[PDB]
Amino acid sequence: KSFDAPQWDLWQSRPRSEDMDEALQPFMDMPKSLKDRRYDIPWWANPFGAWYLQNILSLELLKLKSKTNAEKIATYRSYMRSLASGKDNTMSDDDVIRNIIKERWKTLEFGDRNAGYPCTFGDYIQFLNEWFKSLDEEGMQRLREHFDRR
């Protein structure tokens, strides 16, 4: 056996067919006896899927800092008619919202979830693997576009 750190690409060098049955590598390497013990449950019962559901997908639970009346007025009159020299920020609550989301992706950390953080790493790539196998044609097209862009 080779005891150096695991490569994630090993499937490309070896002609083993159980590989291609699953997306990510550590699940390709998984014995059948263990794969038997993964049980099918709703996608949000996967703690990472839960995290994704709460933070990203649920807008309704997102609260924004409420604007004062002065702020409401200055903002409105900025939006409707532009006069130069003004504060360049005037940030759309759309931009703000998307900033809060992207920093929610920043602040997401994995680990033991009896400690602080929401997800095991294994938990995360597990949801990821279930999802990558789950892709349609236009699904993985959207994926590859997303990948080419970012």
Partner 1 sequence: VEYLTGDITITTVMQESYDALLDTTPHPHLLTNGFTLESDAAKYTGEVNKAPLSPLQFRIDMEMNKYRRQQKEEGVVRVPPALWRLDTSAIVPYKVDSKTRRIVNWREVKEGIEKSFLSVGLPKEAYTGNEWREMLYLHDVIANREAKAAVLEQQQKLDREKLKARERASLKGEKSSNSASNGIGIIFPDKDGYQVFFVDEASLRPFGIGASGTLFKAVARVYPSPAAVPYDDPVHGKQFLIDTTDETCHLFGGFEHGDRLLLRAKSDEE
Partner 2 sequence: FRMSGGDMFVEYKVLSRDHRRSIRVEDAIVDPTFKRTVLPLGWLELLRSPSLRLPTGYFVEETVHVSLPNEANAIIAGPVVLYITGQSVPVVLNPYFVPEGTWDMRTRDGELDLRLGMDAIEQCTLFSELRPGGLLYGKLPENPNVRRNESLRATLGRYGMKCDLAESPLVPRPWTRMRYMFIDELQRGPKLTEFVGHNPRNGTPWRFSQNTKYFRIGIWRDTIRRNDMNEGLHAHSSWQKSPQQSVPEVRFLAPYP
Partner 3 sequence: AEERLKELQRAPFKREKYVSLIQGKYTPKVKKFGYTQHTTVDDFETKE
| Chain positions contacting partner 3, by CB under 8 A | 59-60, 62-67, 72, 75, 79, 92-94, 97
The residue among 53, 18, 57 whose CA lies nearest residue 34 is 18
Choosing from 57, 73, 96, 100, the residue that interacts with partner 1 (CB under 8 A) is: 57
Q: The tokens of 35 are what? A: 């794969």
Between 35 and 67, CB nearer to partner 3? 67
Q: Are 28 and 19 in contact (CB under 8 A)?
A: yes
Compare residues 73 and 135 and give the one whose CB is closer to partner 1.
Answer: 135
CB of residue 13 to partner 2, shortest distance in Å: 15
From CA 74, how far away is CA 68, in angstroms rounded? 10
Residues 26, 4: Cα–Cα separation, whole Å: 15
- Given the rule CB under 8 A, which residues bind partner 2? 138, 141-142, 145, 148-149
Q: Min. distance of Cβ 81 from partner 1 in angstroms?
A: 21
List, in order, residues 6 or more apart from 64 with CB less than 8 Å away.
93, 96, 97
Report the residue count for the chain.
150
Q: Does 137 interact with partner 1 (rule: CB under 8 A)? A: no
Residues at the interface with partner 1 (CB under 8 A): 37, 39-42, 45, 57-60, 94, 134, 136
